[PDB]
Design a protein around this nucleic acid. Structure first.
Length: 78
DNA sequence: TCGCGAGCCAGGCCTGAGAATCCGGTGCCGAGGCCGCTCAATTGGTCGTAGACAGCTCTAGCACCGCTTAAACGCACGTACGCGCT
């Protein structure tokens, strides 16, 4: 499972009203068997790529350190 | 979700450059020794008194008891602040 796929799965899995933060996504990936320490840069890059592609809409914070949600709209505007 | 192309990061390899450090020799001036003296440390004596010892008086420091209740305590719960990470 690619980093972005696990990120999307965890984000759709969590039911936070305000979104899933960097710490929350790290905890989810760590619970998913992912090394959150050795691959931190990759997690951040995947998050940024998902934000840029419009897959994840950032709700709080700026950059990688904020919180993000699934965009249920861009999934059908391909 | 897989095949596969190619690029990015982790770490090892290896060397260069710069600096620390050991090795050698020269010289140079301050440490150690010696001589002269002189003054201060020693000895002996006297003498007066500072304090060591013995004794008594009597304060207060210790030990004990009981009653009261102020406070220490253990528990449970909540949150806000320290810590980690970016």
């Amino acid at each position: 499972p690619s980093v972005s796929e696990l990120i999307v799965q965890a984000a759709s899995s969590s039911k936070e009203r305000g979104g899933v933060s960097l710490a929350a996504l790290k905890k989810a990936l760590a619970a998913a068997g992912y090394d959150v320490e050795k691959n931190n840069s990759r997690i951040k890059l995947g998050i940024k790529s998902l934000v840029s592609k419009g897959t994840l809409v950032q709700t709080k914070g700026t950059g990688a350190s904020g919180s993000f949600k699934l965009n249920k709209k861009a999934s059908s505007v391909e």
